[PDB]
Structures are given as structure tokens and as C-alpha cells.
Design an enzyme around this catalytic site. Structure first.
Site, short mmCIF file in Angstrom:
data_model
loop_
_atom_site.label_atom_id
_atom_site.label_comp_id
_atom_site.label_asym_id
_atom_site.label_seq_id
_atom_site.Cartn_x
_atom_site.Cartn_y
_atom_site.Cartn_z
N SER A 136 -5.84 9.24 11.99
CA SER A 136 -4.87 9.71 10.85
C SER A 136 -4.19 11.37 11.85
CB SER A 136 -6.00 11.24 9.88
OG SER A 136 -6.54 9.20 8.66
N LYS B 161 -1.18 8.08 9.75
CA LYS B 161 -1.92 8.35 8.01
C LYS B 161 -1.47 9.65 8.35
CE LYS B 161 -5.21 7.81 5.85
NZ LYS B 161 -6.42 8.21 5.19
N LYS C 82 -0.76 14.05 6.76
CA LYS C 82 -1.55 14.42 5.35
C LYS C 82 0.11 14.75 5.50
CE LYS C 82 -3.82 18.31 4.46
NZ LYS C 82 -4.25 18.05 2.97
N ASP D 134 -0.53 10.36 3.08
CA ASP D 134 -1.48 11.39 2.18
C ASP D 134 -0.57 12.77 1.51
OD1 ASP D 134 -3.74 12.11 1.16
OD2 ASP D 134 -4.92 12.11 2.85
N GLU E 74 -0.05 7.83 -0.45
CA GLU E 74 -1.63 8.03 -1.26
C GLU E 74 -1.58 9.53 -2.00
OE1 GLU E 74 -6.56 8.74 -0.25
OE2 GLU E 74 -4.34 8.16 1.30
N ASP F 280 -7.09 7.33 -5.01
CA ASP F 280 -8.89 7.22 -4.20
C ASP F 280 -9.56 7.64 -5.72
OD1 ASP F 280 -9.25 8.97 -1.86
OD2 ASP F 280 -10.24 7.71 -2.73
N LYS G 268 -13.11 2.97 -1.08
CA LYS G 268 -14.74 3.24 -0.29
C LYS G 268 -15.98 2.95 -0.58
CE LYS G 268 -11.52 7.61 1.01
NZ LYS G 268 -11.41 8.38 0.82
N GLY H 36 -12.37 6.13 5.16
CA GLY H 36 -13.41 6.62 5.54
C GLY H 36 -13.87 7.92 5.00
#
Lengths: 369, 370
Positions: B139, B165, B167, B192, B217, B242, B266, B294
């Protein structure tokens, strides 16, 4: 001179029940709830009630956990910005996920405060409202039909304009038929309390013959799809409860075809602002909305009566006098119920004044700030 | 009889030092707090589980303190009402408790671990086909300095990571993505959005649709299904949800509304392994790309994450890293192996880790519940 919170006080109240609760976790001889009193720089005071149960059976929030979220996260958020309008509170609390009842406890108190600030009854902020309103009555499971029929008769004798019968698998068609037979035009609804599954669709469809106003939450509290499967096959309006936390949940239900009625509870939805948005949406999309109770004290009850007094709430809600569940209240005056009709409190804000004598014997006081 | 007779339940309230402290609306947190639960049966077998809930309700509603309370007040008493034979029985036992997913998972995951050890098997032997080693993703936060960003992507690739990933935020998306897709036209890349967009930003998100992104996401609100569906119908790229996915039913609703084509899974957020298994299966059955996210787990939760994410269905590398990426030390005796983007899945009974008594003494408060 914007609203400047001078202090916040709270009472952890435990009000003795005429009929104690039996839960999977044990017995409960009283309804516990926390009161919040918010005082501004003018001395005005806003009252709010945290109504969350002591166990996560109805919904996730519990009294102890919400009490913590209030002091650890919500109050600090409420004290950073000066509030001009009560509608701003929901926005301020937006960063806290969930904890609807904890938010409502504080948010409803700010609405009360603001109303008092304007020297007006809170009803003046709910658009048009009634002075008195008809309220419904709910009967539990009565295996002895004859006595049940007796109950309905006494209900009608006492002027109740609507009746709610709790129902379960081996108790639905028979009792509803009996009451519809002796009372052909009596507004009747049933409460399934998630006691059925999609496999019972055949059984539930039989109720379509008795002209019920609605069937409340027959399937799981967290379900939309099964209810939609049922609603498509039913003429009767299905009503959702636990599942409706916000405007968006109503939008999802409408999209899926999950229901045609909404059981609205201010604490469950996070407050007045959210309750108002939900009510407006139901009016615009043919979703019969009504107000439900949560064993509130006179503080929450006063608000429910005022909110339910709007013309829109045509279907009598689950609101009674405090003595229906308790021996005493923590406010000074009793609500007046005459022939199934209750008077909507007038007077500044929610129109009730705390009973210091009773609070002294039923609660624990603490000044948060 | 073949039932797990719980002889004792112990808990550790841990606070593990972070390499990069958290910055919340309630203050800076120098460590990730979490509680561990140890369930010992009559044979001396011990199951380990972790309560991962954050100390503030910003991600999701559960917080460490409140879930800790629900666990002792409601879940543990319930857990002890039946002589459990199969771990699947826990989620059914806990069904009457509304919400509190993270609190449920803490105990439910420990029971699965206990049962596996009891059966003399690694937990992986209950998740169907599973891999021995798996690639994990990396990330990267917002980086206005593109040059450095391109440098970090160059580092990751050199280090072996097979997916990155990034942001993203309204005025920061096409720019960094286009830059990376131009320098790495074949690297698997996801974005994300962290709920930073609104439906009105549709045109801006559509521009992202031309960079072969694995997925975007949660562009909109954490509790939204409808806006996401509107966006999804306009994009070739997969939208991922999510916060919104707490159960199999939530996936069923998302699928029915057309809200997404990918799910961030998750275990704690979903209430445990049983629900997680039902979700993964439904995703595989309905072409929803599922991958493991995570939550800054300690080695206990991390060991389970690797074992669950090792199933070949989890093709997209998840947010699983060595404990060293976030923490100075761990509360398990062994560090996780990570070689060129690939991590070793714990073998060994249950989740395959042993608690570090020395580190627990340094970072936690002990309590024998039962």
C-alpha cells in the site's frame, strides 16, 4: 451569543418495571437508561435520553457501551464547534460510525435546548402538528382465543383506534381470523418479530385475506432480500424495523422492494434530523411510516408524542402513558391518555420538567463537564 | 465424546509500539492496541484469537473497549452454554447477539484454532485448497511528489511485489495512476478511494477506467450501496466494497443492486472464519474478486490471515505484510518470512504460532477470565 455549552450532566437511571424483562442473559427488574442535561450560557437546559437496552438482543447498541462512546468520542466532538442549528449535530457526529442511540441521546437534547432558546415548543420545528393524537395498543400471544377476543373488546371499549397482535408460526391465521370476524373494520396489524423464514411464505400469504394494515418484520432483522420476495407476493404492506437506520436504508429497501411500511424509532435512527429525513422520504414514496416505542422514560416519551403528532403519522403509534410500564416516571407531570388518545405536550422544548425527588431515588448523578 | 470442554479462558490487553503512530481526531496513538484470547480445553490444547477493533469508531463502529465489554458480558457466557463439537457452532451460538462482529471473531477464530489443534491439523486443512507461499501486495499513501512516487513503485517492483495499492483523492487520481501505468503498463494496480468521492465526481472516476485498474475501492460512503451501483454501471473497472460488507447477506444485496464486482474481506469485520468462508465461496460463485484486507493485526491475526488468504481463490495479493512493516516487535515467537513479495504460510497445528511470553510481559496486561 451562539449556543455555548456550559455544562453536561447525566443521570444513570434504573426505573422499576411492572413486568420485568427476561433475556438470554438473565432477568431485568428495571429499565435502565441515561439522561443527559445540556445547559447553555443562558441557563437553558436541553434534555436527552439514551434508551439502549442492557443487552444486544434488539439491536447492537447497549447502554454501557453507548454511555462510553458518548463520553469518549461524541461529547468531545459536540464541544469543539459552536452550534447554530440542531441539524448540524448529525453532521458533527458523522465521523463516528454507527452508535445511533448514543448519538440520538445527545442530538435530541440539542434540539430541546435550541427550542427552549427560541422560547418555543419543539413541536414548532416539526411543521404542522396535532394537539392530541390517537395511539395504538399491542397485545402479546394469547393461546386462549376467548380471552384474546376479550382483550380486543376492552381495547375498543377504551377507544383504541388500532390494534397490534404479536404472531408466530403456530399462532397467526387462527387468531387474526377470530378478531377480524368480531371486528370487521378495526385497523389491525401483526408483529412477527422475525419469527418466520422464507419457507413460511405460504402461511404468511393467508393473512392477505384479513385486510391487515401491515405485517412487521416477519424475517431476520438484518434482511432485505427475503422480505422483498415476500412483499412481491403480498398485497399487505410488510414493515421493517431493526434494518432501518437511515435514509439510505429506506432507499435500499425501496429499490429492492423489501417493504411498504417503516417502523420509525428516533433513537434507532440516530436522532430527530435523521428521523425527519426518513419521514419525508416515506411520504414521497408511499411508505407507511409510524412511530414505535422503546420503553422510554417521560423524557423520550415527550419527544415521541411531539414527533408523532405530525399529520403524516396517521397510523397510531406505539406510545403509552409512562405508567403502562413503570410505577413512576422521572419527570414531574403524567401524560394524559383518554380513550386511546394522548395529549401532545406543549411548553418549551419537549414540555417536561425533571423530577428531582424521583431522580434522587432511582438514579446516580454525575457532572461530565 | 468429541466435544471441546473449555477449562480456561485467558486474555491479554496488548499495546504494541508502532513504527508510525496513528493520528486520530481523538489524539495520537503510539501503539496499536488489541486483546488476545487464549482458550484451553481439557486436553491442554490452546486456541488463540485476536480482538482487532480500533480505539476510535472511525473505520467501523466497533472499538476495542466496547467489544472487550461485550465479549465478557454477553459472548463468553453464550460460548459456554453448549458443549461445542464443531467450530461452525460458534457463529450460530452468537447469532442472537446483534452486531459486534469484531468481538465475535475474536472468540470464534480462537475456537477454530483450538479445534484444528485438537484434530492434529494445521488450520489450512479446513479451508479447502491452500497454498504454501503467497504473494502479498503493498500500500502507498498520497504522494504529491510524483517523482518519488514513481520511485517507490520502482522499489516495490524491484522488491518483488506483484500488486500495488494507491490511496486516491478527488484532485489526486488520474495523475499518479497515469504516471504509473506509463512506467509499468503491466503491473497489477488498484486504487483506494477511502470514501473521498461523491456521485457528482463520476466524470473524474470514469477517467480512471482507462488504466486497466484491478479495482477502485469504496469511492463513495462507507454505508452506500446505491451510489456505488450507479458508478459501477458506468465503469469497466471493478468497484470494491469494504466497511459495507459484514456478511454473506451484504454480498447478496450488493450483487442484487449491482453495487460492486469485488470485495475487500477482513475476517474480524465479518464475525469470524465461518462467515468469511461463506463470503469467499459466494464471491467465487458470482465472479466477485475477493481479496484479504488488513487491520494492523499482531502475529496471531496475521497468521490466520495468511492461512485464509492462501486459498487459490485469492488471486489478488492482499494487505498482509510481515509484522515488521508496522511494528518494532510482535507478541509471537517467530517473525513472518517475506522473500521478494512472497510470504510463507504458517504450517504447524492451528494457526501455527506460539505466544512470546517475554513480549507479552513487556506489552500487555494479563487476566484470567475463567
Amino acid at each position: 451569543s451562539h449556543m455555548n455549552i456550559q455544562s453536561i450532566e447525566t443521570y444513570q437511571v434504573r426505573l422499576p418495571l411492572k413486568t420485568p424483562f427476561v433475556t438470554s442473559y438473565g432477568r431485568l427488574e428495571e429499565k435502565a437508561f441515561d439522561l443527559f442535561v445540556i445547559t447553555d450560557e443562558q441557563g437553558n437546559q436541553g434534555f436527552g435520553e439514551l434508551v439502549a437496552f442492557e443487552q444486544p438482543d434488539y439491536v447492537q447498541e447497549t447502554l454501557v457501551t453507548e454511555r462510553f462512546i458518548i463520553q469518549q468520542h461524541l461529547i468531545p466532538l459536540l464541544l469543539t464547534e459552536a452550534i447554530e442549528q440542531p441539524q448540524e449535530v448529525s453532521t458533527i457526529f458523522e465521523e463516528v460510525k454507527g452508535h445511533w442511540m448514543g448519538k440520538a441521546a445527545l442530538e435530541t437534547a440539542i434540539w430541546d435546548l435550541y427550542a427552549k432558546r427560541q422560547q418555543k415548543s419543539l413541536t414548532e420545528f416539526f411543521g404542522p402538528t396535532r394537539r392530541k393524537i390517537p395511539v395504538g395498543i399491542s397485545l402479546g400471544i394469547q393461546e386462549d382465543l376467548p380471552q384474546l377476543l376479550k382483550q380486543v373488546q376492552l381495547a375498543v371499549e377504551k377507544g383504541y383506534q388500532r390494534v397490534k397482535l404479536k404472531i408466530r408460526p403456530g399462532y397467526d391465521v387462527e387468531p387474526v381470523a377470530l378478531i377480524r370476524q368480531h371486528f370487521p373494520n378495526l385497523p389491525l396489524m401483526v408483529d412477527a418479530n422475525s419469527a418466520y423464514t422464507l419457507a413460511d411464505l405460504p402461511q404468511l400469504q393467508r393473512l392477505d385475506h384479513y385486510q391487515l394494515a401491515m405485517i412487521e418484520q416477519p424475517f431476520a432483522a438484518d434482511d432485505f432480500l427475503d422480505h422483498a420476495q415476500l412483499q412481491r407476493e403480498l398485497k399487505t404492506r410488510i414493515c421493517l424495523d431493526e434494518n432501518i437506520r437511515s435514509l439510505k436504508d429506506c432507499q435500499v429497501a425501496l429499490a429492492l422492494g423489501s417493504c411498504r411500511s417503516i417502523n420509525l424509532k428516533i433513537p434507532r435512527v440516530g436522532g430527530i434530523h435523521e428521523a425527519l429525513k426518513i419521514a419525508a422520504f416515506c411520504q414521497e414514496n408511499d411508505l407507511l411510516v409510524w412511530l414505535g416505542g422503546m420503553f422510554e422514560s417521560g423524557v423520550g416519551r415527550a419527544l415521541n408524542l411531539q414527533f408523532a403528532s405530525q399529520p403524516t403519522f396517521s397510523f397510531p403509534g406505539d406510545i403509552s402513558a409512562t405508567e403502562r410500564y413503570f410505577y413512576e416516571d422521572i419527570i414531574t407531570e403524567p401524560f394524559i391518555l383518554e380513550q386511546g388518545t394522548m395529549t401532545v405536550p406543549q411548553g418549551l422544548g419537549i414540555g417536561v420538567t425533571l423530577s428531582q425527588t424521583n431522580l434522587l431515588k432511582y438514579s446516580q448523578y454525575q457532572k461530565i463537564m
